[PDB]
Amino acid sequence: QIPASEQETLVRPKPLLLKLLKSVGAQKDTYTMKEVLFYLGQYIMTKRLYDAAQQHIVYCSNDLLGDLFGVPSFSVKEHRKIYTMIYRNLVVVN
């Protein structure tokens, strides 16, 4: 749901999100908004944090993601909430 004119926008992750991106094989200091979203998804998928029956539910209270996002869990259906949680851990270039 990122507009096309914003998918390539460069962003500078803060340390805690930078740690998370690195754990799934990222090696950059600077990312596009779309890359940040993909790697976050791969981190959730590689750690199997989503509920197997109701796959929009992500459990993260025992995980680095929950300290980063500041919630014990969240629903992927809540897009505006997730963007706010990501933008809190980013620095967008203007």
Binding site: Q1, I2, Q7, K34, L37, F38, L40, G41, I44, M45, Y50, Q55, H56, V76, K77, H79, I82, Y83
Partner: peptide
């Protein structure tokens, strides 16, 4: 879905 608006019910389609 978070990236480009893709629809679906599995985690991957919902995250996309």
């Amino acid at each position: 879905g978070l990236i480009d608006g893709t629809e679906g019910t599995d985690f991957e389609s919902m995250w996309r």
